[PDB]
Design a protein around this ligand. Structure first.
Ligand SMILES: [Zn+2]
Ligand SMILES: [Zn+2]
Ligand SMILES: [Zn+2]
Ligand SMILES: [Zn+2]
Lengths: 107, 62, 108, 1458
């Protein structure tokens, strides 16, 4: 995780996905002032294991992409550090059912 | 700098129109109303009720 | 009291099986011409709404332009199929113009 | 459709492709070469458009199949184009590939390794693997060919391995996986590929430059210009505008499509190319034209005139040009001019086929092309596929009828003798059909036709009783032919009283406007008769309305109209789960009288009212003998009460096996109207007996938790229907014996009451001037004729805002006088009083009208409001020529003291007319397109057998409907625990568990429910982010239809809370099981089209909000901002900031001002420019601001803050504005001896400013800013004041980005909040001392998505749509909103219900039937797409049964023999 102050050079930004399997994540300290997952409208997002995903895709007979989507650059997706393929479990409070578990695939 | 009133105060503007009607929320006597002829010239008039205790708007023709 | 000039149903109509347009093969427009009542997109939506798939099939197909048409399984088309012209004793058979080869061209 | 004619073959999928010239030449029935259509005499010319080889025409037999005009299907022909032509639809694409290719090495100018990278990514995307396509970019080693070829090898190795690995598992099939997100990733790449392809100038393979290709509107390509620097490299290429023919372009693309075949293989194939077909360039070119069969090109006949074929006109013109140009090029062989007309002919043939296909993209009325034919108006798909004119249907004006059943329709005998059903003759119905056959087509119940087993038809129309009798005795004869022994004869019998019909009242805004009714043929009728209970659902008033009757022609369609779309199941609408069925007017007024204490009845009268509405012979009874209660009065005379009739009707219609209904409800009529100490408002039902209270619109109307609704929940829908029909008859019979009338006596006030009216209205004269004196701000209340007041009112007249303040104040004051009159006079001042005052009775009962209408009749009309304000006023200050200019009277403003009983004064009447006309125009001027956009994108969305909400293509939208899987038409008494308790044994018998206990689990879910409740109670005070994620909800782990206890935590909390707060032979444990079982039986059925239902539930009630405002965007425009356009640029963007408790009301208002920002314009009072022309144009600009303490207390701006802005921003902005204006033209107190610190400041400013020369600012007091500007002698005249003015209102001293104003409204539902007129979260994040950063709400969805994520934006959509409905007091189930929001957020973005959002959808047929049919078709062909026919639209296009509801499964027959 690299917390930068104002801006990063376009040449320096190319060096971010240059060393696999190691991953690099950049964040502006002004954007980290307030935690987004602490907001009342942002439910609890939980990243699922390769086994938990495998089980979910079986119960509903789903294909990776056949699921609701979460963008790889989505604020919460960037917070949990989601990679493409990773499934996230969303426990959201409904004004009809209360606690409800939904899911989203990061592509 | 204008001698006449240019702006209204935060709460110094009371709702004038009031009619005796049972409140469905809890049970109040005083209730505000509004009139406007919607739809065709054959269709009736719609009444827009408003509560004074909470401040809840409403819409029912009959 | 005043009696208004309009008949109550001047647009009063009933159609069982009346004339159809050549292109769509669907009931033609016109009350006096024994025309059909239109089942528009909203009525289609309502029949989808009830989850009533046979009522939709009944209006938008069965009682509209339902045609049992010949299709070639080899090339998948309704426009290349045609009824063959048989000899004095032989029977006519549905044949595809696309998949069939000209007799002379069939060489070994 | 014939059931005797089954079909064994079916279309499973449609493949989009391009016809090859070689393919067309072989299938062609005849080559068309002649532009003439007819020979002399009248026979079609050989080689022409009407050739008999193209099918039977002009009573001649087809020369291909030999059949006549009826049986001949028609045959396709072809036109041989002498030169290849660009196909108009694919010109844009071939153009992209032409500009992207090198004219030397004949490869794309993009580097081979980069091209291979796209081919790799696109191959991996043929299969559903997006993650792998991105992982390919990670594979990395002016660069040598030996190194780059190794990169291509390593990349190809990963592609081959990733495909095989996923192929081994169930990740992708041999045919490849294809989803909307996969499609989104493909569409993104194919776009990026073409963008990179077009960007390259110099070829990366061979460094030589290619000449740029330019294009015009029509299909024609040409050469480009070329500077000297470009020339210097085109000559060193070998060292190391002109038109281009169609043949040259085809030849360039021929080689390029061969050399770049590997990438184009995946660029043009959506899924893997299993057919192994070569991607050839000649697909974009037309060497031939297919000639459609004569059948689809027939000349239109209108009466006597036979119009020339619309298609044959332009098509013959193409043939004339083709023959003319092939001969005008043939004489050139024996040879400038001949080349000139040859090229000109080459252009007019391409423009001829372009005109043959399209217009708007031709000419500049021309003949419409085939693209125009598919998009004439709404289009062929919308006008003739998604919608169609139908057979066996009728239309008529509806007339009311209370004597028919609520589930019936009165069919006129005219329709009954024309509408027939194909009834197959059998042993069980030979008797019934023999009679129909004898009766014939004019005697009901008859038959119009008889279909034999051989397939032939025998019309009974012309036949006499003798032939009909003979055919009837030949109906059940055994089939001699073995080829039809399976079949039996059919009788096309008249519509009987046992048939189903689909009643439709347009617009069909919701599925309740299209229900199934039971046919009841009524003799001597000329109109469709309909019961009053149906009035609500159809939204049909008997004001000369028309209704459509559809007669479905098969048993599967019958069953559907009798069990799914039938009227009985429509008692509750799925929008809010509230009733849409009930009695409407006479019946409501009848009930208030019949159930009144004063209503008594003798034995003779009582028994008559019972049999009058309950007939055992018509199956109305449940006891086979009419049971009667004893009288309420025994001595002196035996008498029955009115309420006892209601008890007896229930006693004979409700089952004997079940106990009587127990309900404690309320009335619309208050106890005060029924006298002292009455309890007649409390509706009381104890063991099915009306013991207290009358029955209103609130009981047997379409109103929730009334008697009919209570009966519906305890005894079911069939009983509630019986009760409605029974009550409907009783009140009709009661209104016949005991009538109801309205007259003048019901409109009069008493002498006492009329005195009150005149006295309260006597204070209204002062009100006019009082309010006029308040807004104007004048003490001691100045006279009406005051000269200062009249000058002050003029100031108000000229300003739209100032007049608004005057109108709103005067209106509120006069409306307060109105309310007083009404409250006093009605009802305590009315001469005739309730129940006898029928005018009053109708308003209180809810039969018709309200107390507002009653008050306009008996008291006053009140203030006539026009577009939110009072009466419009002229420039003279007069509201009418009768009133004085600037009259301070209520009457002059539109306040009507007169009533409709006494009459309106001429002055008052004119004002009323303005108000009336305004109401009328809004109805005419002001949900069709909003609903159409939602329904087309949600049609496929339904409930799957795995309880999840899945789209047509199987993609998951929701894991569970509303998160609990409950049907809204069931979620009503599910929280009505006391009701369910009082009816325990009745509901336990309803939800029969004895036949279910062996099919379900009774503990698994119940144990888990306790474990989740345990961890929930542990983190009660804890916030949502810190809450335990150990155990997720019981519904997530256990199927609600298989496990008793897998209930929503909302239901669980509510149920447990009832058992704790209410301690009451039913145990608290056996009741819990019943409610658990009720939830199980309240589940939404798999197959239910929740998509259409949701859009109908948002569409239909959004018609009620067509009226204008009485700041933020409301109604349909706000709903359009969300659903239809998903705007990132909202009209009224806002932020709701929750303020802490430690921040006071004064502190918050100071904070509002701080966010609040002033501009230079806002602090300036006057600007004086003293233009002196000298030497040099001297401009003395003096800035007279407001007092230092004034703007510092109004804008929180200091004098220091003002100094910095003028010395740095304003002067630099002013200098730039003057210079720009020069170019555009040519294209009291005395201050002297300024000193020291001030002198150093002035000298430093002179060095920084070119023309001011001087700069003096009030540093002590802070009231002025003076600066001198020096211009040249050539600058001459200039309007400096106007120049300065514009820059001042452009100069910012203050402002927080994207925010305009922060206000402090009244606490919303107890929450202390601040509403911002702008959106910037990061700025509010810094105000943590004032705002709770975890509760900062915003209406802007896109802004929320950008900062807080997709789930937050999703929650904003469901809240914002709810705000639109809650304002108009409309309740829409959150299950609908959540579905809509989930569909908008399906891609992780914010998609709207429009062409843009739809782009990421599998069905090209669904897309084609929405808009731009030919455009979506082109995109489908280029993808080589397979339409899987899984969307409702696609299925309708190909005549396949819809996969929703009854089409969500298959029916198989169990056969005994092996
Ligand atoms: Zn209230
Ligand atoms: Zn074929
Ligand atoms: Zn033919
Ligand atoms: Zn090249």
């Amino acid at each position: 995780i690299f917390v930068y102050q104002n801006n990063i050079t376009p040449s320096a930004m190319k060096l971010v996905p240059s060393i696999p399997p190691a991953t690099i994540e950049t964040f502006n300290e002004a954007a980290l002032v307030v935690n987004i997952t602490h907001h009342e409208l942002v439910p609890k997002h939980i990243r699922l294991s390769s086994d938990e995903k495998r089980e979910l895709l079986k119960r509903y007979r789903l294909k990776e992409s056949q699921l609701p989507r979460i963008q790889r650059a989505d604020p919460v997706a960037l917070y949990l550090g989601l990679k493409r393929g990773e499934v996230v479990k969303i426990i959201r409070k409904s004004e009809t059912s209360g606690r409800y578990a939904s899911y989203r695939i990061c592509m | 700098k204008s001698v006449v009133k240019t702006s209204l105060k935060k709460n110094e503007l009371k709702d004038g129109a009031t009619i005796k009607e049972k409140c469905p929320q809890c049970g109040n006597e005083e209730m505000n109303y509004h009139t406007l002829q919607l739809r065709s010239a054959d269709e009736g008039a719609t009444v827009f009720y408003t509560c004074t205790s909470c401040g809840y708007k409403f819409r029912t023709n009959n | 009291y005043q009696r208004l000039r309009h008949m109550v149903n001047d647009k009063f109509q009933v159609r069982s099986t009346g004339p159809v347009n050549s292109l769509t093969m669907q009931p033609v427009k016109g009350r006096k011409r024994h025309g059909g009542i239109r089942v528009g997109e909203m009525e289609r939506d309502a029949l989808i709404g009830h989850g009533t798939s046979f009522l939709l099939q009944d209006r938008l197909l069965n009682s509209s332009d339902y045609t049992q048409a010949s299709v070639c399984r080899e090339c998948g088309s309704i426009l290349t199929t045609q009824q063959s012209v048989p000899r004095i004793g032989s029977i006519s058979t549905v044949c595809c113009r696309r998949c069939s080869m000209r007799f002379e061209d069939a060489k070994k | 459709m014939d059931i005797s004619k089954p079909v064994g073959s079916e279309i499973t999928s449609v493949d989009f492709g391009i016809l090859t010239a070689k393919e067309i030449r072989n299938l062609s029935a005849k080559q068309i070469t002649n532009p003439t259509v007819l020979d002399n005499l009248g026979h079609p010319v050989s080689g022409g458009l009407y050739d008999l080889a193209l099918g039977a025409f002009l009573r001649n037999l087809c020369s291909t199949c030999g059949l006549d005009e009826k049986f001949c299907p028609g045959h396709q022909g072809h036109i041989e184009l002498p030169v290849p032509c660009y196909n108009p639809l694919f010109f844009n694409q071939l153009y992209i590939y032409l500009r992207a290719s090198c004219l030397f090495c004949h490869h794309f100018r993009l580097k081979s390794v980069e091209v291979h990278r796209y081919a790799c990514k696109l191959r991996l995307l043929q299969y559903g693997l997006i993650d792998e396509s991105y992982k390919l970019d990670e594979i990395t080693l002016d660069i040598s060919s030996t190194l780059l070829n190794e990169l291509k090898s390593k990349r190809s190795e990963y592609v081959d391995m990733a495909i095989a690995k996923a192929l081994s598992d169930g990740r992708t099939t041999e045919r490849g996986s294809f989803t909307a997100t996969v499609n989104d990733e493909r569409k993104k790449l194919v776009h990026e590929f073409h963008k990179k392809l077009l960007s390259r100038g110099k070829c990366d393979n061979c460094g030589m430059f290619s000449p740029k290709f330019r294009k015009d509107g029509f299909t024609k390509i040409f050469e480009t210009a070329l500077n000297e620097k470009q020339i210097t490299n085109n000559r060193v290429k070998g060292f190391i505008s002109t038109y281009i023919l169609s043949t040259e372009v085809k030849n360039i693309l021929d080689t390029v499509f061969r050399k770049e075949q590997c990438v184009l293989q995946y660029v043009f194939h959506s899924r893997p190319n299993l057919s192994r077909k070569l991607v050839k360039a000649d697909s974009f070119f037309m060497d031939v034209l297919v000639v459609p069969p004569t059948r689809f090109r027939l000349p239109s006949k209108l009466g006597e005139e036979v119009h020339e074929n619309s298609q044959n006109q332009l098509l013959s013109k193409v043939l004339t040009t083709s023959l003319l140009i092939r001969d005008l090029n043939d004489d050139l062989s024996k040879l400038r001019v001949i080349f000139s007309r040859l090229m000109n002919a080459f252009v007019t043939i391409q423009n001829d086929v372009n005109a043959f296909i399209d217009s708007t993209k031709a000419q500049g009325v021309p003949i419409p092309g085939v693209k125009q034919a598919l998009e004439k108006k709404e289009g062929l798909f919308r006008k003739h596929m998604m919608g169609k004119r139908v057979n066996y249907a009728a239309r008529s004006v509806i007339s009311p009828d209370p004597n028919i059943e609520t589930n019936e329709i009165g069919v006129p005998p005219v329709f009954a003798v024309k509408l027939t059903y194909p009834e197959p003759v059998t042993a069980y119905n030979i008797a019934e059909l023999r009679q129909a056959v004898i009766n014939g087509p004019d005697k009901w119940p008859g038959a119009t036709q008889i279909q034999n087993e051989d397939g032939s038809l025998v019309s009974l129309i012309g036949m006499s009783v003798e032939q009909r009798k003979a055919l009837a005795n030949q109906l059940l004869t055994p089939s001699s032919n073995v080829s039809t022994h399976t079949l039996n004869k059919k009788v096309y019998r008249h519509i009987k009283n046992r048939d189903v019909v689909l009643m439709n009242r347009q617009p069909t805004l919701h599925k309740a406007s299209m229900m199934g009714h039971k046919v009841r043929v009524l003799p001597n009728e000329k109109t469709l008769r309909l019961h009053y209970a149906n009035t609500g659902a159809y939204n049909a008033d008997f004001d000369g309305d028309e209704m459509n009757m559809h007669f479905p022609q098969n048993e599967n369609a019958r069953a559907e109209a009798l069990n799914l779309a039938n009227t009985d199941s429509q008692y509750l609408t799925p929008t809010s789960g509230s009733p849409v069925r009930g009695l409407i007017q006479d019946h409501i007024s009848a009930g208030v009288w019949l159930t009144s204490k004063d209503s008594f009845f003798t034995r003779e009268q009582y028994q008559q009212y019972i049999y009058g509405c309950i007939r055992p012979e018509d199956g109305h009874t449940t006891r086979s003998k009419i049971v009667t209660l004893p009288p309420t009065i025994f001595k002196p005379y035996p008498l029955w009460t009115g309420k006892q009739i209601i008890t007896t009707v229930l006693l004979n219609v409700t089952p004997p096996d079940m106990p009587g209904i127990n309900l404690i409800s309320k009335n619309k009529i208050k106890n005060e109207y029924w006298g002292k100490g009455s309890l007649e408002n409390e509706v009381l039902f104890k063991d099915g007996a009306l013991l207290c209270g009358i029955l209103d619109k609130s009981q047997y109307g379409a109103s929730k938790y009334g008697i009919v609704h209570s009966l519906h929940e305890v005894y079911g829908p069939e009983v509630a229907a019986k009760v409605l029909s029974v009550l409907g008859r009783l009140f009709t019979n009661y209104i016949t014996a005991t009538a109801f009338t309205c007259g003048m006596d019901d409109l009069r006030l008493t002498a006492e009451g009329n005195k009150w009216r005149t006295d309260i209205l006597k204070t209204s004269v002062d009100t006019g001037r009082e309010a006029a004196a308040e807004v104007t701000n004048l003490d001691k209340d100045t006279p009406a004729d005051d000269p200062e007041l009249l000058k002050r009112l003029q100031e108000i007249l000229r300003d739209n805002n100032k007049s608004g303040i005057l109108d709103a104040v005067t209106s509120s004051k006069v409306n307060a006088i109105t309310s007083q009159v009404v409250s006093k006079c009605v009802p305590d001042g009315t001469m005739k009083k309730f129940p006898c005052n029928s005018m009053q009775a109708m308003a209180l009962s809810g039969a018709k009208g309200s107390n507002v209408n009653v008050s306009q009749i008996m008291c006053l009309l009140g203030q006539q409001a026009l577009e939110g304000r009072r009466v419009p006023v002229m420039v003279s200050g007069k509201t009418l020529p009768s009133f004085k200019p600037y009259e301070t009277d209520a009457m002059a403003g539109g306040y009507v003291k007169g009533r409709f009983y006494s009459g309106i004064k001429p002055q008052e009447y004119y004002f009323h007319c303005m108000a009336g006309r305004e109401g009328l125009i809004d109805t005419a001027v002001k949900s069709g397109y909003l609903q159409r956009c939602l329904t087309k994108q949600l049609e496929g969305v339904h409930v799957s057998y795995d309880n999840s909400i899945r789209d047509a293509d199987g993609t998951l939208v929701q894991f569970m409907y509303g998160g609990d899987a409950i049907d809204i038409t069931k979620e009503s008494h599910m929280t009505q625990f006391e009701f369910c308790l009082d009816n325990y044994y009745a509901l336990l018998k309803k939800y029969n568990p004895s036949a279910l206990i062996e099919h379900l689990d009774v503990e698994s879910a119940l144990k888990y429910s306790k474990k989740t409740l345990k961890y929930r109670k542990k983190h009660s005070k804890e916030p949502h982010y810190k809450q335990s994620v150990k155990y997720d909800p019981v519904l997530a782990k256990y199927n609600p239809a298989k496990y008793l206890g897998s209930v929503s935590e909302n239901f669980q909390d509510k149920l447990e809370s009832f058992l704790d707060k209410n301690s009451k032979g039913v145990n608290e444990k056996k009741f819990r099981a019943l409610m658990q079982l009720k939830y199980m039986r309240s589940l939404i059925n798999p197959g239910e089209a929740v998509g259409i239902i949701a859009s109908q539930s948002v569409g239909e009630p959004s018609t009620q909000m067509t009226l204008n405002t009485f700041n933020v965007t409301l109604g349909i425009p706000r709903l359009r901002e969300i659903v239809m356009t998903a705007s990132a640029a909202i009209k009224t963007p806002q932020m709701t900031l929750p303020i802490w408790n430690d921040v006071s009301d004064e502190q918050a208002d100071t904070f509002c001002k701080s966010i609040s920002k002033v501009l230079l314009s806002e602090v300036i009072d006057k600007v004086i420019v003293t233009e002196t022309t000298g030497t040099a144009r001297s401009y003395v600009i003096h800035m007279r601001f407001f007092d230092n303490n004034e703007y510092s207390e109004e804008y929180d701006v200091s004098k220091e803050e003002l100094q910095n802005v003028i010395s740095n921003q304003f002067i630099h902005l002013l200098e730039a504005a003057i210079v720009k204006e020069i170019k555009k033209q040519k294209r009291v107190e005395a201050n002297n001896n300024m000193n020291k610190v001030q002198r150093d400041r002035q000298s430093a400013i002179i060095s920084h400013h070119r023309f001011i020369t001087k700069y003096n600012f009030d540093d002590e007091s802070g009231k002025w800013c003076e600066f001198k500007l020096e211009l040249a002698a050539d600058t001459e005249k200039l309007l400096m004041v106007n120049i300065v003015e514009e820059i001042c209102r452009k100069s910012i001293i203050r402002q927080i980005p994207h925010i305009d104003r922060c206000v402090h409204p009244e606490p919303e539902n107890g929450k202390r909040v601040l509403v911002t007129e702008g959106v910037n979260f990061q700025a509010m994040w810094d105000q943590e001392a004032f705002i709770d950063v975890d509760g900062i709400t915003s209406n802007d969805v896109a802004a929320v998505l950008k900062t807080y994520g997709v789930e937050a934006a999703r929650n904003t959509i469901v809240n914002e749509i709810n705000n639109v409905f809650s304002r108009y007091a409309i309740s829409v189930s959150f299950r609908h909103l959540d579905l809509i929001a989930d569909m908008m957020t399906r891609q992780g973005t914010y998609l709207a219900f429009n062409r843009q959002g739809m782009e990421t959808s599998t069905s090209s047929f669904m897309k084609m039937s929405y808009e731009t049919t030919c455009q979506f078709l082109t995109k489908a062909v280029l993808d080589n797409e397979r339409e899987q026919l899984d969307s409702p639209s696609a299925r309708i296009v190909v005549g396949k049964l819809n996969n929703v509801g009854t089409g969500s499964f298959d029916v198989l027959a169990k056969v005994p023999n092996a």
